Ligand SMILES: C[n+]1cn([C@@H]2O[C@H](COP(=O)(O)OP(=O)(O)OP(=O)(O)O)[C@@H](O)[C@H]2O)c2nc(N)[nH]c(=O)c21
């Protein structure tokens with residue numbers, strides 16, 4: 001398991017958490033020096049449990065699929081909650097078995113669905129460590145509307161930070177003050193699958209992407225990523241989604 005405590009949290013302890021999260025995702029191979037998540041994992045080993053504690057020390061446990069860093073559901077006291085998708089219902093067979101009741105959320109785990117349920121795109125939703133404390137608090141008591149926004153915060157401050165060093169740094173900058181994600185943050189989130197696939201297809205194309213990936217950079221400018229010498233590949237991305245799962 002991995003854990004993160006918002007009480008006493010600073011850029012450094014958040015960093016350790018993101019490192020611990022990445023370290024808990026298995027790989028047998030690295031591709032252009034980037035860990036390649038597994039094609040699949042059988043049984044309960046498929047799910048990582050993240051123990052998150054808010055400022056007051058209350059806690060939720062979040063179930064994460066180690067092949068794709070997708071959050072499947074979470075446990076709040078004696079109730080488990082799962083996204084309304086076959087993958088999460090499959091996860092429910094393995095995690096939080098001991099919960100008193102299991103609630104299926106009235107949405108699946110994707111950004112579009114969650115933004116509809118929350119009432120705002122994530123461009124407008126502040127993220128940061130304080131926002132993560134708010135999200136943990138919100139998830140402790142069922143409210144499907146509030147939970148959508150909380151889960152949008154949670155996914156970004158965990159899974160997305162694990163996937164991109166830039167995103168991890170963005171959250172570290174927001175350790176004491178939330179701010180809506182940069183356009184580069186949104187762009188990277190949106191391109192993870194695409195990037196993961198082009199990096200793998202470059203393996204036998206001399207490091208050249210079969211298809212250029214369009215991104216917004218740190219200055220908020222639109223750049224074209226065409227090969228593995230790009231800083232997005234050499235410095236930023238930390239985990240690759242396996243092409244088997246694309
Ligand atoms: C398809 N899918 C993706 N995710 C993750 O939840 C977030 C919202 O899901 P998404 O499908 O909107 O992701 P996105 O468009 O960013 O696609 P990607 O670049 O290929 O990852 C994603 O960004 C992933 O973090 C998903 N999470 C869950 N729980 N279930 C899913 O079916 C699922």
Ligand SMILES: *[C@@H]1O[C@H](CO)[C@@H](O[C@@H]2O[C@H](CO)[C@@H](O)[C@H](O)[C@H]2NC(C)=O)[C@H](O)[C@H]1NC(C)=O
Nearest residue numbers: 207208209224225226227228229230231232233
């Ligand atoms: C490989 O990617 C690099 C970028 O990392 C490309 O070089 C960039 O492209 C043009 C000049 O050709 C400039 O706009 C950028 O400043 C360049 N970046 C750097 C870091 O030099 C390069 O063209 C790509 N190679 C191929 C074959 O597509």
